[PDB]
Scaffold this active site. Structure first.
Site, mmCIF file in Angstrom:
data_model
loop_
_atom_site.group_PDB
_atom_site.id
_atom_site.type_symbol
_atom_site.label_atom_id
_atom_site.label_comp_id
_atom_site.label_asym_id
_atom_site.label_seq_id
_atom_site.Cartn_x
_atom_site.Cartn_y
_atom_site.Cartn_z
ATOM 1 N N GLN A 102 12.686 -7.039 46.707
ATOM 2 C CA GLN A 102 13.919 -7.787 46.714
ATOM 3 C C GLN A 102 13.560 -9.378 46.360
ATOM 4 O OE1 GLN A 102 17.436 -5.094 48.559
ATOM 5 N NE2 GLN A 102 16.364 -6.913 50.000
ATOM 6 N N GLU A 116 8.009 -2.455 64.514
ATOM 7 C CA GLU A 116 7.543 -3.424 63.819
ATOM 8 C C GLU A 116 6.509 -4.162 64.363
ATOM 9 O OE1 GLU A 116 9.933 -5.400 60.911
ATOM 10 O OE2 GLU A 116 11.973 -4.463 61.460
ATOM 11 N N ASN A 161 16.357 -14.384 50.619
ATOM 12 C CA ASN A 161 15.225 -14.423 49.519
ATOM 13 C C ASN A 161 15.516 -15.301 48.404
ATOM 14 O OD1 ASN A 161 14.365 -12.234 50.843
ATOM 15 N ND2 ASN A 161 15.582 -10.569 49.675
ATOM 16 N N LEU A 164 -6.292 -18.967 41.493
ATOM 17 C CA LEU A 164 -6.263 -18.167 42.908
ATOM 18 C C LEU A 164 -7.536 -18.672 43.704
ATOM 19 C CD1 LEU A 164 -5.019 -14.851 41.954
ATOM 20 C CD2 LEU A 164 -3.687 -16.900 42.550
ATOM 21 N N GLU A 219 -8.914 -21.484 43.786
ATOM 22 C CA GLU A 219 -8.484 -22.883 44.438
ATOM 23 C C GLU A 219 -7.632 -22.655 45.640
ATOM 24 O OE1 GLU A 219 -7.683 -25.581 41.227
ATOM 25 O OE2 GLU A 219 -7.426 -27.286 42.656
HETATM 26 N N1 LIG Z 1 13.106 -11.419 54.120
HETATM 27 C C1 LIG Z 1 13.422 -10.310 53.740
HETATM 28 N N2 LIG Z 1 13.066 -9.295 54.732
HETATM 29 C C2 LIG Z 1 13.389 -8.162 54.467
HETATM 30 C C3 LIG Z 1 13.930 -7.671 53.220
HETATM 31 N N3 LIG Z 1 14.176 -6.550 53.243
HETATM 32 C C4 LIG Z 1 13.532 -6.124 54.521
HETATM 33 N N4 LIG Z 1 13.227 -7.057 55.011
HETATM 34 C C5 LIG Z 1 12.465 -7.165 56.247
HETATM 35 O O1 LIG Z 1 11.137 -6.177 56.236
HETATM 36 C C6 LIG Z 1 11.055 -5.610 57.432
HETATM 37 C C7 LIG Z 1 10.743 -4.047 57.143
HETATM 38 O O2 LIG Z 1 11.613 -3.557 56.148
HETATM 39 P P1 LIG Z 1 11.327 -3.320 54.627
HETATM 40 O O3 LIG Z 1 10.177 -4.043 53.867
HETATM 41 O O4 LIG Z 1 12.129 -2.991 54.070
HETATM 42 O O5 LIG Z 1 10.611 -1.827 54.564
HETATM 43 P P2 LIG Z 1 9.763 -0.828 53.557
HETATM 44 O O6 LIG Z 1 8.681 -1.387 53.427
HETATM 45 O O7 LIG Z 1 10.800 -0.502 52.373
HETATM 46 O O8 LIG Z 1 9.498 0.393 54.111
HETATM 47 P P3 LIG Z 1 10.122 1.974 54.498
HETATM 48 O O9 LIG Z 1 11.726 1.801 54.172
HETATM 49 O O10 LIG Z 1 9.953 2.072 55.956
HETATM 50 O O11 LIG Z 1 9.494 2.644 53.629
HETATM 51 C C8 LIG Z 1 12.100 -5.855 58.363
HETATM 52 O O12 LIG Z 1 11.695 -6.965 59.085
HETATM 53 C C9 LIG Z 1 13.200 -6.509 57.587
HETATM 54 O O13 LIG Z 1 13.873 -7.693 58.215
HETATM 55 C C10 LIG Z 1 14.333 -8.643 52.325
HETATM 56 O O14 LIG Z 1 14.831 -8.529 51.265
HETATM 57 N N5 LIG Z 1 14.037 -10.010 52.800
#
Ligand SMILES: Nc1nc2c(ncn2[C@@H]2O[C@H](COP(=O)(O)OP(=O)(O)OP(=O)(O)O)[C@@H](O)[C@H]2O)c(=O)[nH]1
Ligand SMILES: Nc1nc2c(ncn2[C@@H]2O[C@H](COP(=O)(O)OP(=O)(O)O)[C@@H](O)[C@H]2O)c(=O)[nH]1
Ligand SMILES: O=C1c2ccccc2CCC[C@@H]1Cc1c[nH]c2cc(Br)ccc12
Ligand SMILES: [Ca+2]
Ligand SMILES: [Ca+2]
Ligand SMILES: [Mg+2]
Ligand SMILES: [Mg+2]
Lengths: 62, 417, 280, 437
Positions: free
Chosen positions: D15, D183, D228, D252, D254
Site C-alpha cells: 500500500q 508485533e 500512506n 545508494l 552515498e
Molecule cells: N503505514 C501503514 N501501516 C500499515 C499499513 N498496512 C498495515 N500497516 C501496519 O503494518 C503492521 C502489520 O501489518 P501488515 O504489514 O499489514 O502485515 P502483512 O505483512 O500483510 O502480514 P500478514 O498479513 O501477517 O501476512 C501494523 O502495524 C499495521 O499498522 C499501511 O498501509 N500503512
C-alpha cells in the site's frame, strides 16, 4: 560558517555548510537452519499423530 | 477462506439453526437460498459461510432424528443441503460415552464423508466451527469425537466451537457435570478457540434483565443467535482488518490451553444506544454470557466489535476510556491487549450494537463450578454405571477431573502474575 | 478520576504529594509498572523518559525535567557556568571553580580552597572552589549558615520560588521571619533587599540558561520538577550559589504547605479537579 | 545511469508502494498507462528517471518494482486498480494464505514455498539493468509477511547480490493503528535477522504519522490512505535524488557514506516540513527559515523522540521548491544559536544540503495542500534509540511469561531465537549509548 562543494544544475543545487570540524551466511547455512526448523515441525506433527493413534486404540478398547 | 460449520445434538442443532436464520437475513439470503439484498457488502465475503443460489456450508449431525426434522420444518429449514443431514435412530441418552465410544462411533465416519466433500471444494479452508452443548450426549460425546477425527485429518486447520455449558438452573439430567468434565478435557487439547456460553447466564439475562419470568430455550437461544452473529461479523463482512479464524487465535490465545472466551453483547428498541452506553454495557458483568464476574479475574486479551454507523472517534475515546479506569483488570504484561473493530451493517432491528469477546482468568469460576458438581457425585461413584456399562473405567473419570483442576490452576497462576 | 504511579518510595516530598492526591477522591495510584497513568513520580536515576507520551488517550506528566542533571551535578554545573555564554566566564555569584581537566589553568596566586578543606594544594584519589573565607555570622554565636530555597518549575516553564526558605546553621533551622527580623535589628536592612534579590536573580539565570535544552512545551509528555538551591551569604551581604539539588527534601514544618503548592500549581494545573509562591 | 529495484513486501509495503509509484508518476509526468509524453527518447534511455523506470518499444514506462504478498487481496487491487497497465503481471506476486501475524510463519513455514519464485522475478529485473545499484525494500515491522518474509528475502539478496546496497523503509508499530498483540515480537525477530543485511533503514513510526495527520491535517481518524500519502512524500524526498538531476545522494552507496558512519547504527531519523491541509481556507506560505526550524521539532519527526538528549553523527537537508543556498545558511546560522545541536566529536558539525527546484507534488484531491517550498531532514541521532527501548520493553513484558511463544515454536522456531534476537537488540541499545552519552 563555511560553504564547500557547491554544485549547480537546472534542477537545483547542493552544497555542504560546515559549522565546526572534528576532534555473510552462505546459502547453505541458511538452508541448514531452515531445514532444521522444518524437521522440528514434522517431529511435532509426528508426535500429534502418535497421540491420536493412541486415542484411537483407547476408543477401540472401550 | 471458507469455514465449515458443524452442529451436533439437540442444543447444537437448535442454536445452529437460529444462527443460519440470523445471518442469512443479514446477508439477504431468503428461506429458498435466493438472494434479495440491496448492498454488495452482503456478498463480498458471502463465501465464508455459503456455497454457490446460496447454500450454507453446514453439516447437521444427531443420533436421534427428532430435532433435525424440526430444523427441516422450521423457518429456513429448506436452505440446508439435504445430503448434509447425518443422523442415526437410537440417540445417546444424555450419555457422553454413548456419544463418544459406542453409538457415536458407529455414525462418525459418515459425518466425516460429508465434512470431506465440503472441505475438498474449498479454495482455502480456514477450519471448522462447531455448535453443541457439553451436558448431553451427542453434542458432548459425539461432538468431541468429531473434533478428534477432524484434527487428525486436518491437523493444520483452525478448530472453533460454540460450547453451551450445563447449569443446575436450567438442567436436563443430573449427569451433566460428568458429560461436561469429559468434554472440557477434549476441548482443552483439540480446539483453538471455545466460546463458553453458560445456560445459567442465559437464564439470568432473560429473567433479571429482559423481564421474562418463564424463559424458554427459545429465549435463551435468541441471545445465543445475537452473540454468534456479533462474534462472526468480522469474518462475514469486509473490514480494514482481514479477520480470519487464525488471526483471532494468534492474538487472543497467549497460552495454548487458555482459549476459552467469555462472550458478551449490548444491548440486550426505539432509542438507539449512544457509544458510551455500548462500551459500558458490553463490559458489564450483566451483559456477559458465561456467568463469571470479570472483576474476579484479569483480562489477558479482549476483542470488541461495534456494529452500525457511529463516531469511530468516540468509539476509540470510550474504549480508551474504559481501559484507563479498569486497568486493575487487564494484565500489564501483554501490552495493548484490547482490540477494537467496527462494521457499518448493524444486525436486524438495531442501529447500534456491540459484541465483546474476553479471554479472562475469571472463566476459572466456571470450571470450578463444574468441578464441584462433578466431585460431589464422583466421590460416591453415583450414576457411574451409565458409563461403565458402555465400556468406560473410573480412571478416565479421575483423569478428566485432574485435567480440569489443572486447567483451573493454570488460570489462577496468570491471574497473579 | 486521574491515575498516577509511584517509583521513588522513599521521597519524603512525593510520599506526601501522593497522600494528598489520594485524599482528593479524584486520584488513584497504580502499580509502578502499569503504563496507563496520567502522572509519574519517577525514580531519581535512569528515569525512563523515552517511554513517556506514547499512550494514546493519556496526557502524561512527570515530576522531573530530562536534562536537569546539568544543573544538579557539581561537575556539570561548573562546566555550564564556564562554558554557557548566558552565564559568562565568571558571573560574579558563583565561586571560581575547577573541574578527574583544568589543573594547569588552575591562577592560584588568601588562597584557601575546597569535594564531590585545606590551604595547600589533591591526594583524595570532584571540583575545587574558593572556600568563602569571610562569611556572615549570626550573633550571638558567631555562627555560619547557608540558605535553602525551594523552586518549582511547572510544565509551562513558570518559575515558582517558595516564599518559605530555611536557614540551617537555634530550633539548627532559622526560618525567614526570624532571619528577617534579625537583619533589620542587626543591620538595618531587610531580607528582601539585602539577599533575596540576588537569590531570585541567580535562580532565574540558571533555569533560563537550560530552558531551551529541557523545556517540554512542544514535547509529547510534560515535565515539572522541584529544585533546591543552596546559597552562602558573605559579610558584605553578597550572595553566592553553592549547589542546586534536583531531588531535595523540605523542612519539617514546611512539608505541608509546599506539598499543597505542588498539587495546586504543578499537577492540578494540568489535571483539574471538581499564593505561597513568587513567580520569577 | 545505474538502476534501482524496489521491493514491496506485505500489506504495508504494497500500500505504501502504491502511494509512492503514483507520486512518482505525477512527478515524472508518466500517465497511468505508462506513456510519458515528455520522454523524447522513445523506447530507452539513460536519464535520471530511468533509474526507477525501464522502457518498452511501445514507449511504456515500467517501474523497476516487485510486489510480494503471501495472500492476494491487497496486490489484487493493484492488478485491477487505476494503474493496472503500469506493471507487468509478473512483478505482482501473491500466494494463497498469509502469515497470520506470525514471524515464524512468514519466515520458516509459508516463506520457503515462495522465496525461490520471488528471487526469480527479481533476477528477471536485474538482467534488464546495465549497472544495478541495489534495492529499496518496503515493509512493516509488525506483520507476519512484512517481518518474516522480508528478513528471509534480505538474507538471500546478500547471497545473490553481495555487492549491491540494500535500503529499507520500515513501518514501526503503533497501537492506535496496530493489528496484532505480537508485533513487538515480529519487530525484534526481524530487526535481529536483517541488521547485518541492511545498509540504511528509514523507520517510520505509525504513531508519529498518525498524530501529524490529526494535528496538521485536521483528520479526526486518519486512514491508511491518509497515512500512506504523507509517507509517500517523505519517501519521495529521500529518493528524489536518485530520480532527478543533482549531486547529493545520487546513488545508494552515498546514503551509507553520508548518513551511516557505523554499520549497525544505520537508522537515520527523518523529519519533514511543512505539512498542511488542503482544506485550509486561508494559509500563509512558510519561509525557508520557518520550515528549517520546523526540522528540529519532534512533532514533525517520523519517530517521536527528543534529539536534544543525544548526539548527531550526520545531518542532511533535502529541500524541494523555492529555496536558494543563501536562505538556508541564514536559517542555519540563526537556528544554531537557538537549538541544542550536539555532534559526536569524531564528526564535523555541519550540514549537507540538496535543493531540487520543482516544488512538492500532491495527489489531486488528496489532503496535502500544495506548498512553495518543503524540506526533509535526514539526521543520524542517538535519540532514535528511544524507539528501540520502547519496543524492547514491550517484548520483555510478554516474553518474561512466554506469552504467545508457542505460536512461533509451533512453526519450528526455538526459544533461543527469541533470546538471541533480544540480546542483539540489547547490544544495539548499548552501541547507541556508547556513541551518545
Ligand atoms: N503505514 C501503514 N501501516 C500499515 C499499513 N498496512 C498495515 N500497516 C501496519 O503494518 C503492521 C502489520 O501489518 P501488515 O504489514 O499489514 O502485515 P502483512 O505483512 O500483510 O502480514 P500478514 O498479513 O501477517 O501476512 C501494523 O502495524 C499495521 O499498522 C499501511 O498501509 N500503512
Ligand atoms: N441454551 C440451550 N441449551 C440447551 C438447548 N437444548 C438443550 N440445552 C442444554 O443442553 C444440554 C443437554 O444436551 P442436549 O443438547 O439436549 O443433548 P444431546 O442431544 O445429547 O446433544 C443441557 O445442559 C440443556 O440444558 C437449547 O436449545 N439451548
Ligand atoms: O480477525 C479477528 C476477528 C475474527 C472473528 C471475529 C472477530 C474478530 C475481531 C477483529 C480482529 C480479529 C484479529 C485480531 C487482530 N489483532 C487482534 C488483537 C486482539 Br487483543 C484480538 C484479536 C485481534
Ligand atoms: Ca448401535
Ligand atoms: Ca526515454
Ligand atoms: Mg436433551
Ligand atoms: Mg497481509
Amino acid at each position: 560558517m563555511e560553504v564547500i562543494e557547491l554544485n549547480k544544475c537546472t534542477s537545483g543545487q547542493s552544497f555542504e555548510v560546515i559549522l565546526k570540524p572534528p576532534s555473510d551466511p552462505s546459502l547453505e547455512e541458511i538452508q541448514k537452519k531452515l531445514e532444521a526448523a522444518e524437521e522440528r515441525r514434522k517431529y511435532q506433527e509426528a508426535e500429534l499423530l502418535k497421540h491420536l493413534a493412541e486415542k484411537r486404540e483407547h476408543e477401540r478398547e472401550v | 477462506r471458507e469455514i465449515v460449520h458443524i452442529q451436533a445434538g439437540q442444543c447444537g442443532n437448535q442454536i445452529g439453526a437460529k444462527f443460519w436464520e440470523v445471518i442469512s437475513d443479514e446477508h439477504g439470503i431468503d428461506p429458498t437460498g435466493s438472494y434479495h439484498g440491496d448492498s454488495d457488502l452482503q456478498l463480498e465475503r458471502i463465501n465464508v459461510y455459503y456455497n454457490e443460489k446460496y447454500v450454507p456450508r453446514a453439516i447437521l449431525v444427531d443420533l436421534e432424528p427428532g430435532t433435525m426434522d424440526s430444523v427441516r420444518s422450521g423457518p429456513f429449514g429448506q436452505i440446508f443441503r439435504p445430503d448434509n443431514f447425518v443422523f442415526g435412530q437410537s440417540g445417546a441418552g444424555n450419555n457422553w460415552a454413548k456419544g463418544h465410544y459406542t453409538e457415536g462411533a458407529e455414525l462418525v465416519d459418515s459425518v466425516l464423508d460429508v465434512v470431506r466433500k465440503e472441505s475438498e471444494s474449498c479454495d482455502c479452508l480456514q477450519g471448522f466451527q462447531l455448535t453443541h452443548s457439553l451436558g448431553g450426549g451427542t453434542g458432548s460425546g459425539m461432538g468431541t469425537l468429531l473434533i478428534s477425527k477432524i484434527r487428525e485429518e486436518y491437523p493444520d486447520r483452525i478448530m472453533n466451537t460454540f460450547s453451551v455449558m450445563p447449569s443446575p438452573k436450567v438442567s436436563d439430567t443430573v449427569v451433566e457435570p460428568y458429560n461436561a468434565t469429559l468434554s472440557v478435557h477434549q476441548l482443552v487439547e483439540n480446539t483453538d478457540e471455545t466460546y463458553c456460553i453458560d445456560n445459567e447466564a442465559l437464564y439470568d439475562i432473560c429473567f433479571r434483565t429482559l423481564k421474562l419470568t418463564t424463559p424458554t430455550y427459545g429465549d435463551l437461544n435468541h441471545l445465543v443467535s445475537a452473540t454468534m452473529s456479533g462474534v462472526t461479523t468480522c469474518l462475514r463482512f469486509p473490514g480494514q482488518l482481514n479477520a480470519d479464524l487464525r488471526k483471532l487465535a494468534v492474538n487472543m490465545v497467549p497460552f495454548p490451553r487458555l482459549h476459552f472466551f467469555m462472550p458478551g453483547f449490548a444491548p440486550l428498541q426505539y432509542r438507539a444506544l449512544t457509544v458510551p452506553e455500548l462500551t459500558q454495557q458490553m463490559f458489564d458483568s450483566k451483559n456477559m454470557m458465561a456467568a463469571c464476574d470479570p472483576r474476579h479475574g484479569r483480562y489477558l486479551t479482549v476483542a470488541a466489535i461495534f456494529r452500525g454507523r457511529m463516531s469511530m472517534k468516540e468509539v476509540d475515546e470510550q474504549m480508551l476510556n474504559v481501559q484507563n479506569k479498569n486497568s486493575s483488570y487487564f494484565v500489564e504484561w501483554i501490552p495493548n491487549n484490547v482490540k477494537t473493530a467496527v462494521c457499518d451493517i448493524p444486525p436486524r432491528g438495531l442501529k447500534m450494537s456491540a459484541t465483546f469477546i474476553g479471554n479472562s482468568t475469571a472463566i476459572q469460576e466456571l470450571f470450578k463450578r463444574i468441578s464441584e458438581q462433578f466431585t460431589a457425585m464422583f466421590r460416591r461413584k453415583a450414576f457411574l454405571h451409565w458409563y461403565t456399562g458402555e465400556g468406560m473405567d473410573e480412571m478416565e473419570f479421575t483423569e478428566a477431573e485432574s485435567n480440569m483442576n489443572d486447567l483451573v490452576s493454570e488460570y489462577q497462576q496468570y491471574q497473579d502474575a | 478520576m486521574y491515575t498516577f504511579v509511584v517509583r521513588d518510595e522513599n521521597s519524603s516530598v512525593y510520599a506526601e504529594v501522593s497522600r494528598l492526591l489520594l485524599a482528593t477522591g479524584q486520584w488513584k495510584r497504580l502499580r509502578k509498572d502499569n503504563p496507563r497513568f496520567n502522572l509519574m513520580l519517577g525514580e531519581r536515576n535512569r528515569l525512563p523518559f523515552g517511554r513517556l507520551g506514547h499512550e494514546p488517550g493519556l496526557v502524561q506528566l512527570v515530576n522531573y525535567y530530562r536534562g536537569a542533571d546539568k544543573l544538579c551535578r557539581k561537575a556539570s554545573l561548573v562546566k555550564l557556568i564556564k562554558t554557557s555564554p548566558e552565564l559568562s566566564e565568571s558571573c560574579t555569584w558563583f565561586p571560581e571553580s575547577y573541574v578527574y581537566d583544568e589543573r594547569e589553568v588552575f591562577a592560584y596566586n588568601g588562597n584557601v580552597w575546597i569535594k564531590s578543606i585545606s590551604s595547600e594544594a589533591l591526594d583524595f584519589i570532584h571540583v575545587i572552589q574558593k572556600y568563602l573565607e569571610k562569611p556572615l555570622l549570626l550573633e550571638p554565636g558567631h555562627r555560619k549558615f547557608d540558605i535553602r530555597s525551594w523552586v518549582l518549575v511547572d510544565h509551562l516553564y513558570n518559575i515558582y520560588l517558595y516564599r518559605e526558605g530555611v536557614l540551617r546553621t537555634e530550633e539548627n533551622e532559622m526560618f525567614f521571619e526570624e532571619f528577617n527580623q534579625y537583619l533589620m535589628d542587626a543591620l538595618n536592612t531587610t531580607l528582601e533587599n539585602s539577599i533575596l534579590l540576588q537569590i531570585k536573580h541567580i535562580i532565574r539565570s540558571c533555569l533560563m540558561c537550560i530552558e531551551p535544552a529541557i523545556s517540554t512545551k512542544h514535547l509529547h509528555y510534560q515535565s515539572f520538577q522541584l529544585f533546591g538551591f543552596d546559597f552562602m551569604v558573605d559579610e558584605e551581604l553578597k550572595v553566592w550559589l553553592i549547589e542546586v539539588n534536583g531531588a531535595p527534601a523540605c523542612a519539617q514544618k514546611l512539608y505541608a504547605e509546599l506539598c499543597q503548592g505542588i498539587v495546586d500549581v504543578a499537577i492540578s494545573s494540568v489535571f483539574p479537579l471538581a499564593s505561597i509562591f513568587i513567580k520569577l | 545511469m545505474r538502476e534501482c529495484i524496489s521491493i514491496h513486501v506485505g500489506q504495508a509495503g504494497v500500500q505504501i508502494g502504491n502511494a509512492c509509484w503514483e507520486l512518482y508518476c505525477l512527478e515524472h509526468g508518466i500517465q497511468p498507462d505508462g506513456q510519458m509524453p515528455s520522454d523524447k527518447t522513445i523506447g530507452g534511455g539513460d536519464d535520471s528517471f530511468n533509474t526507477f523506470f525501464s522502457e518498452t518499444g511501445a514507449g511504456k514506462h515500467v517501474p523497476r518494482a516487485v510486489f510480494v504478498d503471501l495472500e492476494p487481496t491487497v496486490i489484487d487491487e493493484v492488478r485491477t486498480g487505476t494503474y493496472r497497465q503500469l506493471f507487468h503481471p509478473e512483478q505482482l506476486i501473491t500466494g494463497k494464505e498469509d502469515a497470520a501475524n506470525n514471524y515464524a510463519r512468514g519466515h520458516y513455514t509459508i516463506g520457503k514455498e515462495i522465496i525461490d519464485l520471488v528471487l526469480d522475478r527479481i533476477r528477471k529485473l536485474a538482467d534488464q539493468c546495465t549497472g544495478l545499484q541495489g534495492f529499496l525494500v518496503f515493509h512493516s515491522f509488525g506483520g507476519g509477511t512484512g517481518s518474516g518474509f522480508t528478513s528471509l528475502l534480505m538474507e538471500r539478496l546478500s547471497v545473490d547480490y553481495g555487492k549491491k546496497s540494500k535500503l529499507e523503509f520500515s513501518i514501526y508499530p503503533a497501537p492506535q493503528v496496530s493489528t496484532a498483540v505480537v508485533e513487538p515480537y515480529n519487530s525484534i525477530l526481524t530487526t535481529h535477522t536483517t541488521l547485518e543485511h541492511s545498509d540504511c533503514a528509514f523507520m517510520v513510526d505509525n504513531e508519529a504519522i498518525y498524530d501529524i495527520c490529526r494535528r496538521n491535517l485536521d483528520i479526526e481518524r486518519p486512514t491508511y490512505t491518509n497515512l500512506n500519502r504523507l509517507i509517500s512524500q517523505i519517501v519521495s524526498s529521500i529518493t528524489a535524488s536518485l530520480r532527478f538531476d543533482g549531486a547529493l545522494n545520487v546513488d545508494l552507496t552515498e546514503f551509507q557514506t553520508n548518513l551511516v558512519p557505523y554499520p549497525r547504527i544505520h537508522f537515520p531519523l527523518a523529519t519533514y516540513a511543512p505539512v498542511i491541509s488542503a482544506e485550509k481556507a486561508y494559509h500563509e506560505q512558510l519561509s525557508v527559515a520557518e520550515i528549517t526550524n520546523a526540522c528540529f521539532e519532534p512533532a514533525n519527526q517520523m519517530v517521536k523522540c527528543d534529539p536534544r538528549h543525544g548526539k548527531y553523527m550526520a545531518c542532511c537537508l533535502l529541500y524541494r521548491g523555492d529555496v536558494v543556498p543563501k536562505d538556508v545558511n541564514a536559517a542555519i546560522a540563526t537556528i544554531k544559536t537557538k537549538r541544542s545541536i550536539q555532534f559526536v566529536d569524531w564528526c564535523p558539525t555541519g550540514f549537507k544540503v540538496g535543493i531540487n527546484y520543482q516544488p512538492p507534488t500532491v495527489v489531486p484531491g488528496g489532503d496535502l495542500a500544495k506548498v512553495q517550498r518543503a524540506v526533509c531532514m535526514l539526521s543520524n541521532t542517538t535519540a532514535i534509540a528511544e524507539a528501540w527501548a520502547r519496543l524492547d520493553h514491550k517484548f520483555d513484558l510478554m516474553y518474561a511469561k512466554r506469552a504467545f511463544v508457542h505460536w512461533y515454536v509451533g512453526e519450528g522456531m526455538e526459544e533461543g531465537e527469541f533470546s538471541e534476537a533480544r540480546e542483539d537488540m540489547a547490544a544495539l541499545e548499548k552501541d547507541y549509548e556508547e556513541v551518545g552519552v
